[PDB]
Amino acid sequence: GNPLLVQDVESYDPVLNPVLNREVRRTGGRVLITLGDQDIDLSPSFVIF
Amino acid sequence: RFNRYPLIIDPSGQATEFIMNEYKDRKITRTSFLDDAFRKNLESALRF
């Protein structure tokens, strides 16, 4: 749940696509976003720049 | 107050009803050992 600031967008990493698209699963009370193969619980207090 | 995970023996089903009504604030998936959708449920519960 930390703010993230990543510079040098020109070498963009397309692993950030579900994060930017908010492709989120809400199974149960948890909040899930799947990047790559790992499934990561998504905290509400996350921002990226 | 268990340390090792319990094994409830209940022919009547009253213990099952009690534990479902008791741990209802959290999320319970009542699985079974012969259910095909058991390993996935166990892994989800273990992670969550």
Q: Which descriptors apply to this entry?
A:
10% helix; part of a larger assembly; 2 chains; 1 helix; alpha+beta; motor protein
Written description of the protein model:
The structure is cut from a larger assembly and holds two copies of chain A. In chain A, a hairpin with a 2-residue loop joins strand 2 (32-35) and strand 3 (38-41). Chain A has a three-stranded antiparallel sheet with strand order 1-2-3. Chain A has 49 residues and is α+β, with helices and mostly antiparallel strands. Chain A has one helix spanning 17-21; strands spanning 24-25, 32-35, 38-41. The first copy, chain A, contains one helix and three strands; from the N terminus they run H-E-E-E. In chain A, 10% of the residues lie in helices and 20% in strands. At the A-B interface, loops of A face loops of B. It is classed as motor protein. Keywords: Complex, Human, motor protein. Cryo-EM structure of Pre-Chi dynein bound to Lis1.
